[PDB]
Amino acid sequence: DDFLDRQVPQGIVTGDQIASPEYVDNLVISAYAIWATGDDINSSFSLWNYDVRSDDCYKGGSGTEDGGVFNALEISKGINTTDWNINDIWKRLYQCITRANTALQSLDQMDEKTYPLKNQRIAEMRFLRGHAHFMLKQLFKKIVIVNDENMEPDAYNELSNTTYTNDEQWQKIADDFQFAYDNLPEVQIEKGRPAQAAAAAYLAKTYLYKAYRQDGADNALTGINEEDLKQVVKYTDPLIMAKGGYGLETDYSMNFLPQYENGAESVWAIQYSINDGTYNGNLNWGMGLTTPQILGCCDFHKPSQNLVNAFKTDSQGKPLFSTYDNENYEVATDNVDPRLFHTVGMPGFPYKYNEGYIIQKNDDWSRSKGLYGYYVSLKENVDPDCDCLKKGSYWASSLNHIVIRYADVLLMRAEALIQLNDGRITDAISLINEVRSRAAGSTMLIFNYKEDYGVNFKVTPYDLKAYAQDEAMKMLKWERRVEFGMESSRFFDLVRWGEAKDVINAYYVTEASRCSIYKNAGFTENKNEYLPVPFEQISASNGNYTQNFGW
Amino acid sequence: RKADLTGAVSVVKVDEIQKQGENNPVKALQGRVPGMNITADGNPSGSATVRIRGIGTLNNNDPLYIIDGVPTKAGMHELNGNDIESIQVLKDAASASIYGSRAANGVIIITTKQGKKGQIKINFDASVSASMYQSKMNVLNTEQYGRAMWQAYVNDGENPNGNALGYAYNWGYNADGNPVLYGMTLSKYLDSKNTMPVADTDWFDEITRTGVIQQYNLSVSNGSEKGSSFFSLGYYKNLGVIKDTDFDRFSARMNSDYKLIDDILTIGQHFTLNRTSEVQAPGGIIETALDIPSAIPVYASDGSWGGPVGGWPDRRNPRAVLEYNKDNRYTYWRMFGDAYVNLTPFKGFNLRSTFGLDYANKQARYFTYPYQEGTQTNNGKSAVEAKQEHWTKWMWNAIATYQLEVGKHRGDVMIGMELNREDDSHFSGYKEDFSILTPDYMWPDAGSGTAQAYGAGEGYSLVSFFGKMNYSYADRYLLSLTLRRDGSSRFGKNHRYATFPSVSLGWRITQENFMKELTWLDDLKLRASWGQTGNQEISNLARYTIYAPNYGTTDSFGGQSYGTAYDITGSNGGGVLPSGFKRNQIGNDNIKWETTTQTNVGIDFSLFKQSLYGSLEYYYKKATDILTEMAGVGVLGEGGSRWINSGAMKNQGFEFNLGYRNKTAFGLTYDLNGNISTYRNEILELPETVAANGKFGGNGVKSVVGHTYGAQVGYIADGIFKSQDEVDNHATQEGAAVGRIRYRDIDHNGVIDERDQNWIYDPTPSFSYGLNIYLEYKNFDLTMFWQGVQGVDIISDVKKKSDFWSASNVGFLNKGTRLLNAWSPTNPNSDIPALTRSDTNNEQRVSTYFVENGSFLKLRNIQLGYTVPAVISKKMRMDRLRFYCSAQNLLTIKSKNFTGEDPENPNFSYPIPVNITFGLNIGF
Amino acid sequence: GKSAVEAKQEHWTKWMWNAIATYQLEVGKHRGDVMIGMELNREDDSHFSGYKEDFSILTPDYMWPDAGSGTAQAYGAGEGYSLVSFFGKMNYSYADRYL
Amino acid sequence: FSLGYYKNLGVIKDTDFDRFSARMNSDYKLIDDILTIGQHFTLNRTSEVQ
Ligand SMILES: OC[C@H]1O[C@@](CO)(OC[C@H]2O[C@@](CO)(OC[C@H]3O[C@@](CO)(OC[C@H]4O[C@@](CO)(OC[C@H]5O[C@@](CO[C@]6(CO)O[C@H](CO)[C@@H](O)[C@@H]6O)(OC[C@H]6O[C@](O)(CO)[C@@H](O)[C@@H]6O)[C@@H](O)[C@@H]5O)[C@@H](O)[C@@H]4O)[C@@H](O)[C@@H]3O)[C@@H](O)[C@@H]2O)[C@@H](O)[C@@H]1O
Ligand SMILES: OC[C@H]1O[C@@](CO)(OC[C@H]2O[C@@](CO)(OC[C@H]3O[C@@](CO)(OC[C@H]4O[C@](O)(CO)[C@@H](O)[C@@H]4O)[C@@H](O)[C@@H]3O)[C@@H](O)[C@@H]2O)[C@@H](O)[C@@H]1O
Ligand SMILES: [Mg+2]
Ligand SMILES: [Mg+2]
């Protein structure tokens, strides 16, 4: 009786055939594709949607109702565990983890002699899984460590987020990076595959986050670990970075231009492509909402006035540590860091170095009618005439998203040296001076601003001398703030440093005068610095997931 | 004459079905069958959703139609329903089991017209109808929109002149200090380019029209002792109220039967061919028309399509969308054929071999024209999508029946083997970069851009061995026993086959000799039935862990295509990128049939010489081992969904049908048919992930287990805050202010949070009733059918944008007229919350405010006709000549609680129009 | 190593309408048939096909355009024509001998 | 009413042609032979490898 067996599945591959050696490489590609096709407009792996909680930027759109859950996150009031965005990002990151685990499981059943590059592919898969786990840990303190590729799906119901403590979870996340660094090649011919230097830098980042211990039920910093700082210093050595040929770009804007993709500073980036045979290209759909109103729609991720005032400098070229936010930045009377024009597009200035598009304070540039300001982010945007911009119901480009930058490596080395407090503070000062000098020379596209809009550029490196720990920490914090504007790392840095509450409250108080959106804003001491575990996940895993403190 | 005589069987009078003049015969019987819910949006096609005995399963609930012994599940809108002689609905598992293995959701038996022996007849029917829009949603005009915006601005304390929408307000304060608006003015052009002048546009009137429906049928039948034949040709056309939407259908049916070898051999066939061409309305056209403000003109200054400019909300022009969608016409060919042969070796033995075929072809050509509506544009995107779909089902049935009439004992023994095979396929091509931008030029060979190819195929098979035994004693005691062995290709070999028994008992009390004196009681019968049926309506590839090479060629919204294509080299594209595979679902080899047990008790009575007839039914349905597709736990990632037998559904229902027909002394014949039905549904078991995600109810907050299917959990709105003292007295909550919605504190913790939610929505009506009245008097026949539903709650999405300002995804959208009657110090006698621009109180949350009483009672169809007297017809040689005028959906009565309109369709779907029809019937 | 699939669909639709009026007379030895007719013909043809490449399993079950991972092509064309005819036929028979 | 099935396997390997056919013809005479209505229909399904 073959009547019920004649017909077979069409156009698919069964589960028992996906483990064959001729498909594993394809599966490897899958583990990368999720980082370019598995992100939504409201859930992007850059985590810019959840970075509105910081003081760097507001939330764009027509108004507060446009993304009401994100508005509640920004104001830190009226946040419910039954939020669709939190569950969405949780599910997407665990889908990335699942793809990485499937690739690892397929790779583990191969002979070394038959597949010489087995170790490299395994290291790449572990690096991707660790990156996803690190992003989850940044978003949620308590996450499930899915590091067992040879695990049956049913056992996934027995997984819990409290199996390992905070330190143990950090160590488990860092183990993948350690293996990748021990196994990844020094140089990769394909820019998509991460190199040894990228793994070492991301391991240093993980150890730096591990150093700021968050032990106890609450979310308060309970000390600084010296061993973690030593590990960071070990894994951020300039010799390792120079082995892979990575260094600071000659110009800052080169890090955010299609013409200079996969540069020296681009230690690791998500390769976005156009005209690649898909429906519209593997464009950065996570930045679709960030395009200005001049393109027709969207207009999200609008930088705040606080960041613009932070970019303001004094006559000595140093940032104003106490009087930067007292008055709004003036283009004609106040010295400004050149990095501002590569990050924030102020009104009356060319948009993405295009003379044919000048930002104006009208409805053609702001979708909120001035409610959220008129500033437009420029790092994630591209020139309208680049030919790299395509309309796929959302204006998205093929510009690569650089996950790890060499400036980040230098600043993390400076942070480790400063927090060690065992000498070598001058080395951190030298790294900060190098970053400032790189910023000073980044005027290849904005040199005419002196003779066109009266823009005064004045930035100078710090003098090489003895500096106290608090002064060096403040200078490093200011350098990080002025270096990674609109790069979706301010809130995580504030949470790690343990000063998120005071900074957020001060920002709310300062910006309530010029923005009514922060009229009812309020930040809780131990509740709003970590996204709560989704209620759907807790309900699905009864007696296994514990909600974060304060919820 | 019921074809089961011992189960829950509903016989539908086909004469009243054709009176309504509906393309779909199923839609005509919307409320004429107890325990049967028919939901129709009102689109030109007769497409509708059918639910029998409530919801009894978590998978597809579509009932199994049977026409001329051929089973199917496709809609009857694509078939000609005017050539139907009898309609029978089998809502009992025991009665419907013998008709197929897909009787979990009920079986509907449809019999086509056949030539009556000894006569030859013809019938020609013509019908012309006009459909008019009745549920015209009231929206703010330019002045009303400006007044509402000014009211919101003054309520929020902001300057109304900073709206930056061209509105200048002259306003002041009264004695009490409440703001009052004196006048408003508008700029002539909404933009600085003077290309979009301001105007008062009725978008609902602009996108709606008066549709025309035409129906022409011609049927002929001829019977004889050696055989019979029947041939029918039908044409239908319906223009929808929404512009650029239409549906027409040609139908040709040929039935015949031949008797050879002195009635031993019989060969019959029933065939029909259908051709339906349809242009459908774009998704959310009503929503788009309601959202766009009336200030936007239909046409710009240069004659191009109007669109929002400046700060106006990003809403596409509904008229332009309809104009561009008018070329999205799809053609559907339906092939429904059947050939059967019957042999009688002797008097009591019959052998029937039947072959049925259903072939469906669909061809569509979708066009994407470049549009530029103000700030709304697609960057000059022009594309063509040519899609082809094929469905092929073939069934073979072998039946052996024996009948005996020994003594007072009648015995029927029947056995049968059935084989079903369905194969579906589809493929489509996509082309871009066109220049002329016309349907004639838009062909894939004429394109000059990126081309894409899509294609898929699937199928399944069914094997059934069934046996039915019927015993009748003294025409008083009836016993029925049936057994089914059913197997499908969707399961593994171990769990391929399953067994289903069913038993039915019946006792005719009127045949007992102890009540011979009860002359009034003409007939009384008590019947019971306990049956089991199998359900396997799931995905074909359910037991396989599916890995698919999703390169990323499929269009996706928001960029979540989940494609597998990465530029590992980092060359920004320029060629074929490396690809791979992704997991779609995890297979499960332990999946088996879903077992539904139905217990039915029925009482059939007929009194006063077969004048007052009726039936009362009570049914209990229990579905277990339900094949449900559970989602991933959350850390399983993509492909975590899998099919499992972890469901439990319970349905307890009552039905009552009554009918009284009688004449009158002066010559009036009145027939009244009343019907009432009620049911209660409950979910007993469900997977933990399914209950957590709340796909079947609960909104992801509480488990739906132990509650009705589709029930929704939300907050409770205890009025609105009329003063600051009320705000202070009430428990603290986010966004609390004067004129905002007050939420009840269920747990009395002093703070309103996510735990202050309870079950608020129950989509189960208290009872659904229907009443048909037929009056005959002096060649005048009047038909009047009323359908009512009582005790049903509805969630109104229209209220979300009619009772609030800026409560949608974007602000400055057009709202309802009743929004003008919002709460204010000047107008304290109102329940609508005060207007605001910021949703601080978060009124978009699910609550009792959006739950309204859906009870209604509407005149589904009224018809007044005149029949030509027999002598005039014979003078004109006509056998019958009749004319009639009818109204469909003419009048309705709603509840005062329902603030909206059209309780049957309280959402943004297709509206239900009023039909005025004139028709004629000729019997040459 | 070239693997590809080509899914092609073709439709032809012809419809004809004919109206014929015939009269016959048998007067004396003369038989006369007079027939007139109007005929309308309409033919419409169309075709479209999709092309996909880069398959792995290389079996008819797996070879579907959605399962491909290579360059895809779309082809499509349509055409048609119509015919109108007015014809008349007269037949005369004398003594069943002269036609 | 006619039902036909044909199948031909060519001499060249992997070449074949089969065909199912269903024909229904009918005619009816009404109104004492004044009116006549007739129809002739056929459906064919041919599967071929050339
Ligand atoms: O809330 C409803 C359900 O959505 C859920 C599902 O679990 O989650 C939200 C879900 O929705 C997604 C879609 O990808 O994001 C929506 C989310 O994104 C926000 C910002 O957070 O807005 C982003 C921008 O999107 C814009 C376009 O610029 O509009 C989106 C808006 O429009 C829709 C459909 O809306 C309607 C419905 O018929 O159609 C018209 C046009 O919008 C309106 O009248 C109706 O509201 O799609 C856009 C349509 O445009 C078309 O071209 C017309 O045919 C088609 O391509 C689309 O159909 C919806 O996508 C959406 O409502 C712009 O307005 C915004 O600036 C935010 O506003 C919105 O909430 C996804 O990311 C997320 O997962 C559940 O919360 C809930 O059950
Ligand atoms: O995507 C959901 C939304 O779009 C529709 C089409 O408007 O569904 C899209 C796909 O549905 C398909 C798959 O069968 O058919 C539905 C439409 O085609 C029609 C043509 O008669 O129905 C085809 C056939 O399949 C049913 O719909 C299901 O059994 C039967 O009712 C019918 O016999 C037509 O009735 C439907 O509109 C496919 O054609 C589309 O790609 C809508 O279904 C839905 O609202
Ligand atoms: Mg790129
Ligand atoms: Mg409470």
Can you walk through the features of this model?
The structure is cut from a larger assembly and holds one copy of chain A (about 550 residues) and three copies of chain B. Chain A has one domain (about 1-550). In chain A, about 35% of the residues lie in helices and about 5% in strands. Chain A has helices at about 25-35, 70-75, 85-110, 120-140, 165-185, 195-210, 225-235, 240-245, 305-310, 405-420, 425-440, 450, 470-485, 490-495, 500-510, 535-540, and strands spanning about 265-270, 310-315, 335, 345, 375, 390, 395, 400-405. In chain A, the strands form four sheets. Chain A has a two-stranded antiparallel sheet with strand order 1-8. In chain A, a hairpin with a 3-residue loop joins strand 6 and strand 7. The longest helix of chain A has 25 residues, at about 85-110. Chain B has a 22-stranded antiparallel β-barrel. In chain B, strands 1-6-7-4-5 form a five-stranded mixed sheet. A two-stranded antiparallel sheet of chain B has the order 2-3. In chain B, a hairpin with a 3-residue loop joins strand 11 (about 210-225) and strand 12 (about 225-240). In chain B, helix 6 runs antiparallel to helix 7. The two termini of chain B are about 30 Å apart. Classes of the chains: A mainly alpha (about 550), B mainly beta (about 900). Chains A and B meet through helix 1, helix 3 and helix 16 of A and strand 18, strand 20, strand 21, strand 25 and strand 26 of B. The structure holds a molecule of 7 linked components (FRU-FRU-FRU-FRU-FRU-FRU-FRU), a molecule of 4 linked components (FRU-FRU-FRU-FRU) and magnesium ion (2 copies). One magnesium ion (MG) binds near residues 261, 271, 272, 273 and 398 of chain A. One magnesium ion (MG) binds near residues 749, 752, 753 and 756 of chain B.
List its traits.
part of a larger assembly; 4 chains; A: 551 residues; mainly alpha; two-stranded antiparallel ribbon; two-stranded antiparallel sheet; 8 strands; 4% strand; B: 924 residues; mainly beta; 22-stranded antiparallel β-barrel; five-stranded mixed beta sheet; globular; binds a molecule of 7 linked components (FRU-FRU-FRU-FRU-FRU-FRU-FRU); binds a molecule of 4 linked components (FRU-FRU-FRU-FRU); binds magnesium ion; metal-binding (chain A); SusD-like_N (chain A); SusD homolog (chain A); signal (chain A); metal ion binding (chain A)
